[PDB]
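User: hey, got a sec? need Pheromone binding protein 2 folded
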Amino acid sequence: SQAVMKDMTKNFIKAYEVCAKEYNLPEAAGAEVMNFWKEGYVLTSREAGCAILCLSSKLNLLDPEGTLHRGNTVEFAKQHGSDDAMAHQLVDIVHACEKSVPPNEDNCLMALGISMCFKTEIHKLNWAPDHELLLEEMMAEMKQ
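Assistant: Yep! Here you go:
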């Protein structure tokens, strides 16, 4: 199971509208979160980070320490047909992602940084379903 990684992102934004109302984010935040699906052009904004941050606290599918809980990761993924081993490895690359994303003072900014690099890590392992997307991220690095 690989396509499940994308469906799991859609499942996480299923409560997006509820969360936008909670954190009182502008409508622009919705567009900024979806702008990350654009290819090579990926913006960063505090509002996009706060949307991700609020969803994780809305459901608390994390350890109370604010670290990704392994059980919640495999369970939330299995709702869309994951393999547990694949979903468990996603928690391991979140630790690797800390090298690429040092902490940020604002929790929204840290949330967004880790969220982008979470894809970059699975892309560099070549394990992601979108081979042309991971290939482009590595080619764009060579283009500059």
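Quick note: Residues 107-124 form the longest helix (18 residues). Let me know if you need anything else on Pheromone binding protein 2.
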